[PDB]
Ligand binder design. Structure first.
Ligand SMILES: Nc1ncnc2c1ncn2[C@@H]1O[C@H](COP(=O)(O)OP(=O)(O)OP(=O)(O)O)[C@@H](O)[C@H]1O
Ligand SMILES: Nc1ncnc2c1ncn2[C@@H]1O[C@H](COP(=O)(O)OP(=O)(O)O)[C@@H](O)[C@H]1O
Ligand SMILES: Nc1ncnc2c1ncn2[C@@H]1O[C@H](COP(=O)(O)OP(=O)(O)O)[C@@H](O)[C@H]1O
Lengths: 472, 600, 220
DNA sequence: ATTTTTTTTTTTT
C-alpha cells in the first residue's frame, strides 16, 4: 500500500499480524549499520543468517588436530550490508491519553525508508507484533516488552500545511497587482483582519519583512541589513493575540519567559553521545520572531541578546570551543513594561540595566488603553462580537488585496530575492539614519530597484510617532 | 600470497615507478634525501584511472588487500634505490565523492571515500604493538611472532598476552626495544552545522587514526578527511552492529596557506622606502569608518620581549579603550576577522575565561574538566569584549593580576598550575549620565574604578555633537558613504572614485598586501640607538610636572612612570612596521602625538 | 608549562621501587633518568637531578672556601642583589636581613618569633612588583599569591560548597610557604574577614581550623 | 560513577 485500527486492543490474539493504525511521531535515531552475511577464516563459509546461534571449529582437519570452543574471527570485508533507524511513535490524542498515560511502540527500519520521516507528523503504517526477550527480580513470573517492525508506511499529508516539507498565473497575480501603487498604506487594515488600531504602524510593517539590504563591501563587514521593532504597553490592548494571530502570517514562535532560549550540550541514550541542538538563530536565518517579556525572563540568557542584535557576534565555550554559527535574524518585540505612556513620553527609565535598548532599534510606538469616551464604549462593545458566536474565520477574504496568506507569504518569499536594490541620489542623529534600511526597503515594496529620500520619508513621518517618546 | 593476481597488482603499481613521472616528479630526492622518513608518497587517483583504471577500482571495490601490496611495492623500490630508507620494514601507508555524515547508507564498504565535518571528542593516546621479540637465555635465539588486528589488514594473530613456556619449557623471556609499537588515536565527527535541518537531530561519525596522523588540530575545527570502511564486531551472534570508517590521509582547509616564496618578502622590501605608508596603513582599518587607529597598530602587532641576562623577563602587550554612545560595537569586528586567531568573548560570562572548578555533574567520566579558559588562546593573540562598565568585579582583581603578570595561577583541586599568556584585550563603555564628560567633571562621569590607571596604556578622547556647520557636512558624507558604498562611485558591483582621487589601488590597498608586513614583520628585533632616553626623559619630566595643571589637571589622573614603558614600546611596534633596525627622532615625533590627541 | 603549546594544556606516570624512594617532594622541578604495562592499548627511574631545587643548589641541604677567603663583605650584596633598579639601598638591605635570618630561642617551653615579617603600603612609580618577583625567584622554597585572584585568595587552606564529597583541606600558598616566605601583593584589598586569618598566624606556627572537627596546625 | 533526592554547613546586606 485501506482501513485502520487502534492500539488499545492488540495482543497475543493478533500476534504476527499486519495492521493499520495511526498516531503522531515523537523522535527517533539516525541510521547506523547492518548486514546479512560475510565469512570467517575458520571455515570460510558465508555467514548465512535467517533473521534480520554462534556455532565445531573446522580449523581442524590437519591430520588429528582439533580446535573446539569456537575460534570464529569474523572477516567483515567479506560482508553484505543493510540500513536501520529504530523508530518510535506515540498513540492517538483522542483515545484517553489524559486520565491514562500514552503507550507507544518501538520499530525497525530496513533499507530505503529512513531519511523519510521527521516527528510532528501523522501516519498510517503496517508492522509486525513481535517481542525481543525470552523466559520463565524482573519478571515476577515472565514479563516482556513491546515493539513492532516497519512495513508499508503510508503517511498523511494534510492538505494545506505542507509548504513546509514537500505558478506563472500566480506571478501575474503577483505583479499585475504589484503594478498598483496602492500597497504601502493600503494594507493598514490587513494584518489586523479583525482589529482596529496600529494603522499607521501597520504602515511600518510594510517595510519590515521585506528587509533592507546586506550590502557588503570589498573590505570586511557584513553589516546589519536586518531590522527590528519594539512595542510597549499594558494588557488589554490585545497585543497577545496581535502576536498569536501573526504566527500564521514566514517562520516564528510565540512563547515568553520560563517556558527555546543557546546550545544543547547534553547526552542521549545511545552509547552516551553528547550531540547538540543549536540555538534559534539556527531556526531564524531569514525567519524572524515575535517575542514578549524581555524583562520577565531569566537573566542568564541575555548575553545572547547583545551577541546577536548588535553584530551577530555569536560564540560558545561550554566544551572548550566556539561553535561560531551565524544567522540573518530579526525580531519583533512586545512588553508590559513599567508604567505605560506616563513613562514613555518623559525620559528614560524603563529597564534598570541598560539604555542600550533604544539604540539598536528605531520604531517604538506606544501601546495604550487610552480613554477616549467616544471609542471607549466601542471597545466596550468591540469585545462582545469577539466574545460571542464563532463567525470570523475569513471575514477579511473579500478585501481587494489585504488577505490570501499563501499568496502573500509567497509574495514576500519571492520579493526578498529580486536583487540588490537601493535608493536614489537623495533628534535626526546617526541612529535615526542607520531608517536607511527602510529607504532601500521601498525599492522592494514598490518592487523597484531605486527610490528617493523624501517620498520614502513616509518612514520618517511614521518614526516621528516613536521619537516623541524619547526626544526629551 | 593469496591468489596469484596480487603479484601482478604489485607489478602494475610498480610500473608507475620508472620514467619521467617517477624520474622527475615523485619520490627519491624529493622526500628521501631531504631526510624526512614520513613515508607517505602522495597519490592521486586520477593517475590510477589514467594508467590502470581497473586498478583505480581495485581500491574502491575491495580495500581490504591492495595495501600490504602497496607497501611491498614501496619498500621494494626504496630498498632498490636507498638501503638507508630501508631498515623499517613495516606497512608504510601513503596519501591517496564526498558525502555527508548524514549519507552513509549501508555501503561504501570497501571504499576509500571522503566525508566532511567537525572535530569533537579528540581523545587519549595509546600505543599498540606489532610483534613479540622473544629470546631464550638457555639457547639464546631471538625469535619473533608478529601481531596484527583488523584495523590494518584482515589478518590477526592469536592476539593475546606474551607467549611463554611454549617452545620447550626452556629459559624463555621477552625483550624490549625490539617489539615495536604503533601510535593509536580515536575521535568522532559532526557535520558542519550551518547546513543543519531544523527537524532532525544530526548524526555524528566515528573514526580511528594512526602513526604519523596524530592530531595537528583540535576538537571543534573542520577538515576534509578521507577514509575506508570496516566493521569488526558481531550482530546478535554477539550484540548488534556498529561501525567506523578509517584508513586515512589528512588535509586542512580553513587557513591561509599563502603563495609565499621568497618573492613576497621581496615585495615587502619593494614598498619599503615609501615613507608615510602609515597613512594607508591607518586607512587600512577605517574605509567604512573620523578618528585612533594608528594607535591600534601596536595592539595588532602584540609587543616585544626583553630579558635580563641570568635573570628574568617582562610581559609585553598593550590594551586601551575609552566616550559618548552610538563606533564601538561595530569597530571591534575589524580585529575579529583579520589578524590571526584573536578571539573576542562574551563580556559578561564565565565558564571560559580561565575557570574550571571540576564541573562534571552529568556524565562524570575520567577527566575532571581541567581546562575552560579562552584567554590563554589569547597567548600572543588579541581580544575585545563588551560589558566592561558592566564587568564583574570578580575579574577586575583577576585583570589586576594579568596586567601585572599575564599568567594564571590556580590550584582549585584540579592542580596547582601556571601557564604563559602574552595577551591583550578591549572593552565597552557606558557613563550613567550620557553627555556629561568634563564640565561636571572629567573623570567619574562614567561609573568606573580607578585602580586601573597604569594597567591600560593610553588615555584618549571620543565625543559627539549633532551640529550646525557639520549638519550638512554629515548629510553629504553620509550620502557619499551611502553611494561610495555603492557601485560605479549582480546585486552590487565595485565602487572606486574617491578611492581614485585617492591615488591608491586595492591591490596595493589589500589584505594580503596588508599582512605582507605582518608575518615577517612580527619576527624582527630592531634594537634602539642612542637618542630616545634623552628627549623622552626631558619630556616625561615635563609630562610628570606640567601635565597636571591649567584646567586639565582633573583630566590628568594617570601619571606614572609605568607609562614610560608604554611610551617607548609603542615606537617598538612602529619600528617593526618598516624593518628599520633602529628607532629615530622621527619615531620620537610620531610617538608623542598620542599625547596631543589625548587632549591637545 | 615552559614548553606547553599556546593552544594546549599541560598534561602529566612515575614508578620507582627499591632504595630510590623519597628523592623528590610535591612540587620539585626534577630530572628523571620506558616500559609499557601488561586491544594492546608508565616509567621506571634511577635518579632525580634538579639544577634548581637540589642539594648543592639548595641552602643547608666549604666548596666556596677559595672564594670565601677572598670575600669578606656586607655591602656588595646590594650591588648584586637585584641590580635592576638604581638607588633604594635601604629597602634591599632590609630584605637582605630577611634573607639573613639566624635568630631564635626556645626558652621555658615557648619559642620566639624569629622570622622577619615586613609590610609595605604605597603606590606610584614605585614598581614594588619587580622586588617581590625578584625575592620569590631567588628565595629558595618561595611562593606567590595576590590580593585575591582565584583558588587561594592569598590564604592558607579552607573547607569552603555543593560540588562533590572530599573534605580536602587544600593547603594553598600560605600553608606551604613555611621555612620560607609567602609574598602576597595588595594585602589591603584582600578582605576584612581575612584579617583574623593573619592574626592567629602572625605569632608563628599556628593556624587552627575548627570548621570540620579537626585540630589543624599547618605549622605557619 | 551516572540515574531519584535534602539538609547542614559554607559564608551574608
Ligand atoms: N566617523 C564615523 N565613521 C564610521 N561610521 C560612523 C562614524 N560616525 C558614526 N558612524 C556610524 O554610527 C553608528 C553608531 O552605532 P554603533 O554601531 O557605532 O554603536 P557603537 O558605537 O558600536 O556602540 P558602542 O561603541 O557603545 O558599542 C556606527 O554603525 C557607525 O557606522
Ligand atoms: N479591540 C478589541 N477587540 C477584541 N478583543 C479585545 C479588544 N480589546 C481588548 N480585547 C480583549 O483583550 C483580551 C486579550 O488581552 P491580552 O492581549 O492577553 O493582553 P496582554 O497582551 O497584555 O496579555 C482578549 O480576551 C480580548 O477579548
Ligand atoms: N628606580 C627604578 N629603577 C628601574 N626601573 C624603575 C624604577 N622605578 C620604576 N621603574 C619602572 O617601574 C616598572 C614596574 O612598576 P611596578 O613596580 O609594577 O609598579 P607597582 O609596584 O606599583 O606595581 C618597571 O617597568 C620599571 O621600568
Amino acid at each position: 500500500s485501506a482501513n485502520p485500527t487502534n492500539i488499545r486492543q492488540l495482543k497475543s490474539d493478533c500476534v504476527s499480524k499486519l495492521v493499520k493504525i495511526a498516531g503522531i511521531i515523537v523522535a527517533a535515531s539516525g541510521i547506523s549499520a547492518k548486514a546479512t552475511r560475510m565469512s570467517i577464516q575458520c571455515l570460510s563459509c558465508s555467514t548465512v543468517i535467517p533473521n534480520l546461534y554462534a556455532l565445531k571449529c573446522n580449523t581442524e582437519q590437519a591430520g588429528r588436530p582439533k580446535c573446539p570452543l569456537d575460534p570464529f574471527f569474523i572477516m567483515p570485508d567479506k560482508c553484505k550490508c543493510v540500513d536501520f533507524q529504530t523508530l518510535k511513535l506515540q498513540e492517538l490524542p483522542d483515545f484517553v491519553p489524559q486520565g491514562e498515560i500514552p503507550r507507544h511502540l518501538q520499530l525497525f527500519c530496513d533499507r530505503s525508508l529512513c531519511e523519510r520521516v521527521v516527528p510532528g507528523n501523522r501516519v498510517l503504517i503496517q508492522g509486525i507484533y513481535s517481542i525481543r526477550k525470552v523466559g520463565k527480580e524482573k519478571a515476577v513470573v515472565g514479563v516482556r516488552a513491546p515493539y513492532m517492525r516497519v512495513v508499508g508506511i503510508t503517511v498523511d499529508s494534510e492538505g494545506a500545511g505542507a509548504i513546509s516539507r514537500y505558478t506563472s498565473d500566480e506571478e501575474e497575480h503577483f505583479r499585475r497587482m504589484a503594478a498598483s501603487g496602492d500597497i504601502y498604506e493600503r494594507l493598514s487594515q490587513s494584518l489586523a483582519p479583525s482589529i482596529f488600531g496600529s494603522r499607521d504602524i501597520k504602515k511600518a510593517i510594510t517595510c519590515m519583512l521585506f528587509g533592507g539590504s546586506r550590502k557588503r563591501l570589498p573590505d570586511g563587514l557584513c553589516r546589519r541589513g536586518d531590522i527590528n521593532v519594539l512595542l510597549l504597553g499594558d494588557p488589554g490592548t490585545a497585543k497577545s493575540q496581535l502576536l498569536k494571530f501573526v504566527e500564521k502570517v514566514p517562520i516564528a514562535v510565540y512563547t515568553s519567559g520560563k517556558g527555546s532560549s543557546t546550545a544543547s550540550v547534553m547526552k542521549d541514550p545511545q552509547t552516551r553521545n553528547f550531540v547538540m541542538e543549536g540555538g534559534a538563530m539556527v531556526l531564524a536565518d531569514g525567519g524572524v520572531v515575535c517575542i514578549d517579556e524581555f524583562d520577565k525572563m531569566r537573566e542568564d540568557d541575555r548575553v545572547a541578546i547583545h551577541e546577536a542584535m548588535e553584530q551577530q557576534t555569536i560564540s560558545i565555550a561550554k566544551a572548550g570551543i566556539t561553535t561560531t554559527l551565524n544567522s540573518r535574524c530579526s525580531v519583533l518585540a512586545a512588553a508590559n513594561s513599567i508604567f505605560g505612556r506616563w513613562d514613555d513620553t518623559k525620559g528614560e527609565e524603563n529597564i534598570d540595566f541598560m539604555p542600550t535598548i533604544l539604540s539598536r532599534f528605531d520604531m517604538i510606538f506606544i501601546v495604550k488603553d487610552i480613554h477616549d469616551e467616544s471609542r471607549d464604549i466601542t471597545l466596550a462593545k468591540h469585545i462582545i462580537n469577539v466574545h460571542l458566536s464563532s463567525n470570523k474565520s475569513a471575514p477579511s477574504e473579500p478585501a481587494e488585496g489585504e488577505i490570501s496568506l499563501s499568496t502573500f507569504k509567497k509574495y514576500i518569499h519571492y520579493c526578498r530575492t529580486h536583487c540588490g536594490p537601493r535608493l536614489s541620489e537623495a533628534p535626526i542623529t546617526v541612529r535615526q539614519l542607520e531608517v536607511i534600511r527602510i529607504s532601500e526597503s521601498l525599492a522592494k515594496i514598490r518592487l523597484q530597484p531605486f527610490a528617493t529620500d523624501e517620498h520614502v520619508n513616509e518612514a520618517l513621518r511614521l518614526f516621528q510617532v516613536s521619537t516623541l517618546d524619547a526626544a526629551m | 600470497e593469496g591468489e596469484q593476481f596480487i603479484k601482478d597488482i604489485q607489478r602494475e603499481y610498480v610500473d608507475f615507478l620508472d620514467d619521467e613521472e617517477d624520474q622527475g616528479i615523485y619520490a627519491g630526492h624529493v622526500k628521501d634525501m631531504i631526510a624526512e622518513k614520513s613515508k607517505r608518497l602522495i597519490v592521486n587517483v586520477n593517475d590510477l584511472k589514467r594508467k590502470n583504471p581497473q586498478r583505480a577500482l581495485g581500491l574502491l571495490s575491495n580495500a581490504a588487500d591492495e595495501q600490504l601490496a602497496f607497501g611491498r611495492a614501496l619498500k621494494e623500490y626504496a630498498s632498490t634505490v636507498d638501503p638507508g630508507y630501508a631498515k623499517m620494514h613495516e606497512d608504510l601507508f601513503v596519501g591517496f565523492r564526498h558525502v555527508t555524515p548524514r549519507s552513509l547508507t549501508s555501503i561504501y564498504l570497501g571504499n576509500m571515500v571522503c566525508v566532511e565535518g567537525i572535530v569533537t571528542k579528540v581523545s587519549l593516546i595509546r600505543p599498540k604493538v606489532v610483534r613479540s621479540v622473544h629470546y631464550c637465555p638457555n639457547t639464546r635465539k631471538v625469535m619473533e611472532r608478529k601481531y596484527t588486528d583488523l584495523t590494518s589488514f584482515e589478518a590477526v594473530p592469536s592476539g593475546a598476552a606474551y607467549p611463554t613456556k611454549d617452545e620447550d619449557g626452556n629459559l624463555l623471556e621477552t625483550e624490549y626495544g625490539l617489539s615495536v609499537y604503533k601510535d593509536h588515536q580515536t575521535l568522532t565527527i559532526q557535520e558542519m552545522p550551518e547546513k543543519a535541518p531544523a527537524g532532525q537531530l544530526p548524526r555524528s561519525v566515528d573514526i580511528v587514526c594512526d602513526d604519523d596522523l596524530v592530531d595537528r588540530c583540535k576538537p571543534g575545527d573542520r577538515v576534509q578527511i578521507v577514509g575506508s570502511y570496516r566493521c569488526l564486531p558481531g550482530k546478535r551472534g554477539s550484540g548488534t552492529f556498529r561501525t567506523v570508517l578509517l584508513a586515512n590521509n589528512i588535509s586542512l582547509l580553513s587557513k591561509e596557506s599563502l603563495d609565499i616564496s621568497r618573492e613576497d618578502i621581496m615585495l615587502c622590501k619593494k614598498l619599503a622606502k615609501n615613507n608615510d605608508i602609515f597613512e594607508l596603513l591607518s586607512k587600512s582599518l577605517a574605509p567604512s569608518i573620523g578618528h585612533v587607529k594608528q594607535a591600534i597598530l601596536c595592539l595588532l602587532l602584540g609587543g616585544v620581549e626583553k630579558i635580563l641576562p641570568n635573570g628574568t623577563r617582562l610581559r609585553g602587550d598593550i590594551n586601551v579603550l575609552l566616550g559618548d554612545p552610538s563606533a564601538k560595537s561595530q569597530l571591534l569586528r575589524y580585529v575579529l576577522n583579520t589578524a590571526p586567531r584573536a578571539i573576542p568573548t562574551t563580556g559578561r560570562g564565565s565558564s571560559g575565561v580561565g575557570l574550571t572548578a571540576a564541573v562534571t555533574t552529568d556524565q562524570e567520566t575520567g577527566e575532571r574538566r581541567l581546562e575552560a579558559g579562552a584567554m590563554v588562546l589569547a597567548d600572543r593573540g588579541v581580544v575585545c569584549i563588551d560589558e566592561f562598565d558592566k564587568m564583574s568585579d570578580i575579574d577586575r582583581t583577576a585583570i589586576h593580576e594579568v596586567m601585572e603578570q599575564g599568567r594564571v595561577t590556580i590550584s582549585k583541586a584540579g592542580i596547582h598550575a601556571s601557564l604563559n599568556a602574552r595577551c591583550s584585550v578591549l572593552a565597552a563603555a557606558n557613563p550613567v549620565y550620557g553627555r556629561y564628560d568634563q564640565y561636571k567633571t572629567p573623570m567619574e562621569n562614567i561609573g568606573l574604578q580607578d585602580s586601573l590607571l597604569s594597567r591600560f596604556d593610553l588615555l584618549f578622547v571620543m565625543l559627539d555633537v549633532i551640529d550646525s556647520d557639520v549638519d550638512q557636512m554629515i548629510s553629504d558624507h553620509v550620502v557619499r558613504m551611502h553611494r561610495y558604498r555603492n557601485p560605479k562611485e549582480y546585486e552590487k558591483y565595485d565602487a572606486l572614485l574617491h578611492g581614485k582621487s585617492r591615488q591608491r589601488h586595492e591591490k596595493i590597498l589589500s589584505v594580503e598586501f596588508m599582512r605582507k608586513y605582518i608575518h615577517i614583520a612580527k619576527c624582527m628585533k630592531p634594537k634602539l640607538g642612542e637618542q630616545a632616553c634623552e628627549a623622552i626623559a626631558n619630556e616625561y619630566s615635563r609630562l610628570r610636572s606640567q601635565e597636571a595643571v591649567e584646567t586639565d589637571v582633573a583630566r590628568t589622573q594617570p601619571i606614572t612612570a609605568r607609562t614610560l614603558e608604554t611610551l617607548i614600546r609603542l615606537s617598538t611596534a612602529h619600528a617593526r612596521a618598516r624593518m628599520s633596525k633602529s628607532v629615530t627622532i622621527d619615531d620620537a615625533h610620531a610617538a608623542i602625538e598620542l599625547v596631543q590627541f589625548a587632549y591637545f | 608549562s615552559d614548553q606547553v603549546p599556546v593552544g594546549h594544556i599541560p598534561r602529566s606516570t612515575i614508578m620507582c621501587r627499591g632504595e630510590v624512594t623519597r628523592m623528590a617532594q610535591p612540587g620539585d622541578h626534577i630530572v628523571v633518568s620506558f616500559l609499557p604495562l601488561m586491544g594492546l592499548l608508565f616509567l621506571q627511574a634511577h635518579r632525580i637531578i634538579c639544577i634548581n631545587k637540589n642539594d648543592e643548589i639548595s641552602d643547608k641541604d666549604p666548596e666556596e672556601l677559595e672564594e670565601l677567603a677572598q670575600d669578606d663583605f656586607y655591602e656588595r650584596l646590594a650591588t648584586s642583589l637585584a641590580p635592576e633598579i638604581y638607588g633604594h639601598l635601604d629597602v634591599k638591605k632590609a630584605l637582605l636581613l630577611l634573607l639573613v635570618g639566624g635568630v631564635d630561642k626556645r626558652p621555658d617551653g615557648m619559642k620566639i618569633r624569629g622570622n622577619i615579617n615586613i609590610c609595605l603600603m604605597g603606590d606610584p612609580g614605585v614598581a614594588k612588583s619587580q622586588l617581590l618577583g625578584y625575592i620569590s625567584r631567588l628565595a629558595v622554597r618561595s611562593q606567590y599569591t595576590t590580593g585575591r585572584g582565584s583558588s587561594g585568595v592569598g590564604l592558607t587552606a579552607a573547607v569552603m560548597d555543593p560540588l562533590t564529597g572530599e573534605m580536602t583541606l587544600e593547603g594553598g600558598a600560605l600553608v606551604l610557604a613555611d621555612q620560607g616566605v609567602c609574598c602576597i601583593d595588595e594585602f589591603d584589598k584582600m578582605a576584612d574577614q581575612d584579617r583574623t586569618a593573619i592574626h592567629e598566624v602572625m605569632e608563628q606556627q599556628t593556624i587552627s581550623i575548627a570548621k570540620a572537627g579537626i585540630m589543624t596546625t599547618l605549622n605557619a
